[PDB]
């Protein structure tokens, strides 16, 4: 546009595909990372079904679709279907050719080595990308919120990651990975829903569970005191008319499921709560470096949007943590797009040149170019 040339920003997860044009502050066309076929055989003739039904077109009509998700936190059940997800991204919504503008993707911390080389194969050899990089999830948001000294816990629907990044990344481990977010809460509901004459059976309607979840479901401050309150039918049940037509008086259902977050013992996992793992990462660093970590805590992700998420942390942490200085948690009121706001940062930096992979660089160091320069 008579400014520069070849530039773009992108970001994908287990919820939405955040992307936009060149030099933007916020996304432009986010869409669900879904994709399925036809369990209904799509009037076979009222088109040769194909196109699994990805994008707004897919999210619109769920019934015909057997929504089979490709990338469940880390593991990619299949790469063949990924081919026609990015074919919908750059060409339909972004309206730009990938054989021109760079690309800034996100990296699920500690992702299988074999996956990186596989992805690069899809871009460089097929979609011809002469410049691109895959930054590491959390570290991005750090520079956006305006923090240089804090501990980041960025996670939404993908995977939980405790990234203590306030003066260095890639160093002692002090990081954790937990497959317990988003889809885990989306699949657990139908189970407990059975006791209330409800059952979102198939995957298509399972996706709706998440929709209603993010508009009412809240977290209990103390399950004990709210157990006796159950008698008082006022703060619990609330009339929610299902778009089709079937009221669901969610009440105790709201604060029962989220309890699993702090208590992973409800789904057969010894994984400690997100406030225990926090200790595990802090106890590794030096002794004279905790007082500043407690001062500011970066809690990001769409998972940190439900009522009663930050106040609970300040109750459990103080217990098994030093009690002398003040403790404050920085949870950006809109901390979901924290990664994208940070993506816009690195997207406009020139120092970033010493990170991405140039067309020729791949052929000069084989497929291992990724893990030979990056880390």
């Amino acid at each position: 546009d008579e400014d520069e040339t070849t530039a773009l920003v992108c970001d994908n997860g287990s919820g939405l595909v955040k992307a936009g044009f060149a030099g933007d502050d916020a996304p432009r066309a986010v869409f669900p990372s879904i994709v399925g076929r036809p369990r209904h055989q799509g009037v076979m003739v009222g088109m040769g079904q194909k196109d699994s039904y990805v994008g707004d077109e897919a999210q619109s009509k769920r019934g015909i679709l057997t929504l089979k998700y490709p990338i469940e936190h880390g593991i990619i059940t299949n790469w063949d279907d990924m081919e026609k997800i990015w074919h919908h991204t750059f060409y339909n919504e972004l309206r730009v050719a990938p054989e021109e503008h760079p690309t800034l993707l996100t990296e699920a911390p500690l992702n299988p080595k074999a996956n990186r080389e596989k992805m690069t194969q899809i871009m460089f050899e097929t979609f011809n990308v002469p410049a691109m990089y895959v930054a590491i999830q959390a570290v991005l948001s750090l520079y956006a919120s305006g923090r240089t000294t804090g501990i980041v816990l960025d996670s939404g629907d993908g995977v939980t990651h405790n990234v203590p990044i306030y003066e260095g990344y890639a160093l002692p481990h002090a990081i954790m990975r937990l497959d317990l977010a988003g889809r885990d809460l989306t699949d657990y509901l139908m189970k407990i829903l059975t006791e209330r004459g409800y059952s979102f059976v198939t995957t298509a309607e399972r996706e709706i569970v998440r929709d209603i979840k993010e508009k009412l479901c809240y977290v209990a401050l103390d399950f004990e005191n709210e157990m006796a309150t159950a008698a008082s039918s006022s703060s619990l049940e609330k009339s929610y008319e299902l778009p089709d037509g079937q009221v669901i008086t969610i009440g105790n259902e709201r604060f029962r499921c989220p309890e699993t977050l702090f208590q992973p013992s409800f789904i057969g996992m010894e994984s400690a709560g997100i406030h225990e793992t926090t200790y595990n990462s802090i106890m590794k660093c030096d002794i004279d470096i905790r007082k500043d970590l407690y001062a500011n805590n970066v809690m990001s992700g769409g998972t940190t949007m439900y009522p009663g998420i930050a106040d609970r942390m300040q109750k459990e942490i103080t217990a098994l943590a030093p009690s002398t200085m003040k403790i404050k948690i920085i949870a950006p009121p809109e901390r979901k797009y924290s990664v994208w706001i940070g993506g816009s940062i690195l997207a406009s930096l020139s120092t970033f040149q010493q990170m991405w992979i140039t067309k020729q660089e791949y052929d000069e160091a084989g497929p291992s170019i990724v893990h030979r320069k990056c880390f």
Partner: protein, 232 residues
């Protein structure tokens, strides 16, 4: 965002302090440079800048999340502040400063490499609005940092006495022979035909665009005089 102007300074030194035209108190041992300042060369001198401001002074960018709510009103003043959407300057509205400044400077260049320009310089006399007073130190400096006398020597080439061919021809016509309308055309062979009939070395003069090149001053006084003791 968190990085202050002070930290920005350190981001320059590490990246450079080797590429010409950039110094500091750390590398260049010069007490004149403060502990919170830096050196930067331009044309012919040195300038030490401060760090105050920079941040809010630079970015200044404005997004459309603060304008939308205001331009939705109904008043020739309120919406008036925002003329009929995009006065031939938009293309893409939301961009983090940096680039926005590049536009104001790029739009300036793009319209310079496609036109026939003309140049005019000016020199301020003094700081008292006097049409007959010279501030020695101030004047000499003004002529230096502009690099005008270097544009005199270098452009031509770099020496003493210089005269234009276009103006040398239609001036020294009535001196030698064979320099009449029966000329050949070339400005080199013709001159050789001129200087050979009066015994003058050829290497002393050379031909280029429109400037005669005879090195050393004495030759000028030698030419002018020679044109006097044999023709009043």
């Amino acid at each position: 965002a968190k990085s202050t102007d002070q930290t920005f300074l350190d981001s320059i030194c590490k990246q450079f302090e080797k590429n010409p035209h950039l110094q500091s108190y750390v590398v260049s041992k010069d007490r004149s440079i403060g502990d919170t300042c830096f050196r930067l060369k331009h044309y012919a001198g040195d300038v030490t800048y401060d760090v105050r401001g920079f941040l809010d002074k630079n970015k200044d960018t404005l997004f459309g999340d603060l304008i939308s709510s205001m331009q939705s009103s109904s008043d020739p003043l309120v919406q008036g502040l925002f003329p009929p959407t995009r006065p031939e300057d938009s293309k893409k509205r939301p961009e983090t400063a940096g680039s926005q400044f590049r536009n104001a400077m790029n739009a300036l260049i793009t319209t310079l490499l496609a036109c026939s320009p003309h140049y005019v310089r000016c020199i301020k006399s003094n700081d008292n609005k006097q049409a007959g007073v010279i501030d020695e130190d101030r004047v000499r400096h003004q002529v230096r940092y502009l690099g005008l006398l270097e544009n005199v020597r270098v452009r031509r080439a770099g020496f003493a006495g210089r005269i234009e061919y276009t103006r040398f021809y239609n001036r020294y016509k009535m001196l030698c022979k064979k320099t009449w309308p029966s000329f050949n055309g070339t400005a080199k062979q013709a001159t050789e035909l001129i200087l050979q009939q009066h015994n003058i070395d050829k290497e002393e003069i050379r031909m280029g665009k429109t400037k005669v090149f005879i090195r050393n001053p004495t030759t000028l006084f030698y030419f002018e005089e020679k044109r006097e003791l044999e023709m009043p």
